[PDB]
């Protein structure tokens, strides 16, 4: 019943939650598929201004055995699900690794979010990937001292 | 007279004492091998070869054995190790005298199998040399 | 009926996003295959195996990704990967159905191979067999 | 036809310079490989596929102290001493174009081999494609 | 006060009979030890406890090389080459009375010393207990 | 004036990435080590010693992580690694100065650790040096 | 006020079922530690912290078990294994409440201990920390 | 609500089901605790002189997070369990070598039946326990030829 | 037109500078390739009494992907090139691992000299090539105290 | 009553039996102390130039655990002990590896010659290398006895 979304083969993207579902859709996940689990790792960036949970509820988890089909399932099991409504501040920096991502948007049973990913190779990342890295790096030190590190990448910049 | 060959990626990981399934198929003439059971039947008595690489889930898992097995009989193994917990793969080819109605098959014993989805980098491929 | 088969060792270091060029070329059957072109035509249709050993450079970088592939769509991958810069092979093994006219050489996705003058110790080998 | 082809596993551990004698044949149908022997004498010359594929282990070497003096007397002396078996493949495939009398085995330039007593993780496979 | 108590962990490795620089200083209340010093040096006579955790690391890399050659000339070689890096800390605790003046250090009487630049694997602390 | 001192062996096994929730308690004075918690919770800021020993267990896994972590900050960390799958302990002993109502607890990053009843094989400890 | 603290290397090589005795005081404030009796008489009520490393003699035996028990009830274990008989310590450390007229004494639990001179390899050291 | 007892402290122990527990209770399981699971090993031996299988059901099955408060969970995830009715001879013996054990009497919804545990070391085990090692170890020796290798373990007697 | 000598085959060699090149020809270069680029390690040796570059130019350097011909194409890289020219002492030594060694004697447009090379398993050096090393290991140190050191190999021997 | 002598801080050490102790004293034993039984091995070496087995009686074993008051009774048990006199060359060579190496000289002379020598078991100093290969000649040169003794890595010309 829950409809899905598969995309895969880009390095950036920026999305609002409203673009990838409705109100009308009750229950619904997209799902990210990183080319190479070896060759490239995800970063995650995103922006919640004034986020409403009473509405619906947004879940985040990484997943490996094609289990999609039994998120309910998962949910049960608790595979590194993790809720981004309690979190304080909006711009947070979910850093992941592996083969499928899956973000649940649910309701308990919208241009203002915004949300964007980048690979990045573990060995010699791309000159724009690095630098848009170090941009929000940026973001994430202007902000308190929030621990924006998070296992720095090779990638240099100002 | 008999033509056969087939060649399949692994899709899915699989940890634990198990049949490896892979099911990526790119060339199935012959049409021998089922992904569901991850097995071989060879309905053509006589000389076949056999090779398979696995590859070794990074970050999660330091030694798995591979054996590659026809019936309950082990006829050949490899060992892929590596303690910083990087890839390495196991691999092994084999030429072996299939009977009628046999079955080979890849069993991990211990370790996790790592698979790329289309990156086909397990891979197990096999084609009969000589019909009995 | 037809006789195409071929084996070539690897002899200057390839780095980067290059086609990989093997040009110590030791058996050589119907002459499909250019050392210069570091590729294999196929003008047999039929299938074919191809098996590829490429040896990591040691010393220098972690990570080797060495892909087989048929016509511009990538048909196999292999890693190698050493934290202590040692020597560790990324080598696969494919039966592939080539018809007429393909192309199938061996990409390297990043890194350095070794550059062996004579050795062989990077080899690729490859031989029909069926015919369609 | 030429109806030849092999297969054989090691068992006895090997070092040295000394050729490498592949004993535990699984198949050796044509009876041109000696077990004992580990080495194949081509009888009927044409092209010959060959691959092998060897389990290396490291000699357990390791050690460390640690000491704790004040101004120099010892007062603390502690040891770490761990040893581990080196596993890792050594393993290439060839095409070879042999003639009447040619002599094909491993020899061994340094290093030490593991041999499974029946676990069969060294192996060594041959067979022929063309008939000369 | 007796106000005595500091911890450090290793960055750098070491090699040799050298003395352990602990550079990476989490606590050094009291000032009585100093990085670039490398000792702990006894400002306040009394009874003190230290204790030092050290993680060995190999270097005992093992290579292995194999040939097959034709008749005696090489046409294959296949390079394994791998450490296991053995993990085992080396570690005492020691009740020392040390008097005005007094100076104490882990020396390394041999070995390797891993070094971890944030995850201190090794780490040496004390603390003063009474003062004399 | 502060009276907190707490040491608890492990009682039941944890693996996976998980905080370790030290159970069978045998002093536990302050009360301030809750034990399903597996946390300290700091109510006198000041500077305090935590050793840690961490059993890994056999006949499952070859390597586990073990780390100390101050809130998020990991402070410390003990690898335990053995080929043979033998029991070997993942130790450490850190000094910190704790601020108010910080919490302090052992996560396991990746791991098998063990399942002692009352033979009480792993532990954890600390107790308060000086007061602020 | 009171002013408890002692250190002990062991001297001779203990083995089988029996208490371990550590003879090397090298420092006894308070001369509570019986050197002979190898067990240590509480006579001023408190908690104390009570280390201890002991290191397995290599070359025989497999597992060595080393239990700290206060009177007769095991308060602590440790566990040194090789399968190469190498050298491992069985270390731990534990703080006890101890009451007046109380008996702590290491007891090796089957295997064979180290016998180290002045070597101080096995060690013992406890402290008083609160007064009751 | 099932009925359990905890017998621990004892190296060798001869019973019988009935003994453990009557036809009185419907449901209930003897839980065995190893006292050191790391010097100490399991060795169970069962013999079942025509046993009622019809009125109930013996099952075996190890566990080690002191989750016996769950054991129809267990039935369902399948951990290892095994079942004695199946089995074709009398002595059929089996070593399971973790730290608790347990036998479920279920009732689906008698000195005849006769069970024995013994504790042995996996290094230096007692002349005693070897040679009650040995008292099995012959009987399945002499039973047709059956598997009585049970890692034969350094106990070596005529 | 430049005129080339591939020499292998051998472990212990010594040339002179007169019978590899004469003054007839204008420019030529000296090669020396490594039986195997990981098994062995090469080892280089010159001696200058008094030799002259007022008159002719003697540089070093390694290739490894055929360059022995593009050497004006090299001069304009500058990969790894040097001159026992401007060596303080006659005796110096440089540490080379590599596939090729190259020896350009140029124009600018003999027994007196003497030059040697050696090879030596890395694992498992001979009687005879460790012992070499040692017969000119302590000459360079008998010198003023230069660094003889060249990473002090694993070759047993005084 | 028995005469013993304890040498220590030594590496090597070339010695005569007349010397370690006179015809005078009935039975006497002399002990050597390794200062770390984990890093450091010994090896033994003795010369008898036509010596007496009729006079004296030479006896060699490890002891590891201060007990040399009581040998007897280690004798009774029989702790591993080698005579030297049935010995067929003077230059019969012994892997003595414990903590406690004792030589008894019992009743039932500079033509007899003992020495001793340590050995890092990982790093051997230069010295120990070279004095290493001087017992190591002369033991082929005496046929050819095997005078690998656990062959060190050792490798010297
Ligand atoms: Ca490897
Ligand atoms: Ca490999
Ligand atoms: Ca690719
Ligand atoms: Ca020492
Ligand atoms: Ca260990
Ligand atoms: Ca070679
Ligand atoms: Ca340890
Ligand atoms: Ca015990």
């Given at each position: 019943f829950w409809?899905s979304?598969?995309?895969?083969?880009?390095i950036?993207?920026?999305?609002?939650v409203?673009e990838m579902?409705?109100?009308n859709?009750?229950?619904?996940?997209?799902?990210?598929?990183?080319?190479?689990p070896?060759?490239?790792?995800?970063?995650?960036?995103?922006?919640?201004?004034?986020?409403?949970?009473?509405?619906?509820?947004?879940?985040?988890?990484?997943?490996?055995?094609?289990?999609?089909?039994?998120?309910?399932?998962?949910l049960?099991?608790?595979?590194?699900?993790?809720?981004?409504?309690?979190?304080?501040?909006?711009?947070?920096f979910?850093?992941?690794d592996?083969?499928?991502?899956?973000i649940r948007?649910?309701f308990?049973?919208?241009?203002?979010?915004?949300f964007e990913?980048?690979?990045?190779?573990?060995?010699?990342?791309s000159?724009?990937?690095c630098?848009?890295?170090?941009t929000?790096?940026?973001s994430?030190?202007?902000?308190?001292?929030?621990?924006?590190?998070?296992?720095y990448?090779?990638?240099?910049?100002? | 007279?008999?033509?056969?060959?087939?060649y399949?990626?692994?899709?899915?990981?699989?940890?634990?004492?198990?049949?490896?399934?892979?099911?990526?198929?790119?060339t199935?003439?012959?049409?021998?091998?089922?992904?569901?059971?991850?097995?071989?039947?060879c309905?053509?008595?006589?000389?076949?070869?056999?090779?398979?690489?696995?590859?070794?889930?990074?970050?999660?898992?330091?030694?798995?054995?591979?054996?590659?097995?026809?019936?309950?009989?082990?006829?050949?193994?490899?060992?892929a190790?590596?303690?910083?917990?990087?890839?390495?793969?196991?691999?092994?080819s084999?030429?072996?005298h299939?009977?009628?109605?046999?079955?080979?098959?890849?069993?991990?014993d211990?370790?996790?199998?790592?698979?790329?989805?289309?990156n086909?980098?397990?891979?197990?491929?096999?084609?009969?040399?000589?019909?009995?």
């Open positions: 409809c979304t598969l995309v895969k083969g880009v950036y993207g920026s999305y609002s409203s579902f409705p109100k859709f009750t229950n619904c996940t997209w799902t990210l598929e990183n080319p190479d070896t060759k490239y790792s995800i970063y995650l960036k995103f922006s919640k201004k004034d986020l409403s949970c009473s509405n619906f509820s947004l879940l985040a988890y990484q997943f490996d055995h094609f289990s999609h089909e039994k998120i309910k399932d998962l049960r099991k608790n595979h590194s699900i993790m809720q981004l409504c309690n979190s304080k501040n909006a711009f947070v979910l850093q992941y592996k083969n499928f991502i899956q948007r649910v308990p049973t919208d241009q203002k979010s915004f990913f980048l690979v990045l190779n573990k060995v010699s990342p000159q724009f990937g630098h848009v890295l170090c929000w790096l940026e994430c030190l202007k902000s308190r001292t929030e621990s924006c590190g998070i296992m990448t090779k990638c240099t910049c100002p | 007279v008999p033509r056969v060959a087939f399949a990626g692994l899709k899915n990981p699989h940890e634990g004492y198990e049949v490896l399934k892979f099911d990526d198929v790119v199935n003439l012959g049409n021998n091998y089922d992904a569901a059971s991850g097995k071989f039947t309905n053509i008595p006589g000389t076949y070869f056999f090779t398979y690489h696995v590859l070794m889930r990074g970050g999660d898992g330091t030694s798995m054995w591979a054996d590659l097995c026809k019936n309950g009989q082990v006829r050949a193994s490899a060992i190790q590596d303690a910083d917990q990087n890839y390495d793969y196991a691999s092994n084999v030429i072996l299939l009977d009628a109605g046999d079955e080979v098959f890849i069993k991990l211990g370790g996790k199998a790592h698979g790329g989805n289309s086909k980098y397990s891979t197990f491929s096999g084609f009969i040399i000589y019909s009995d």
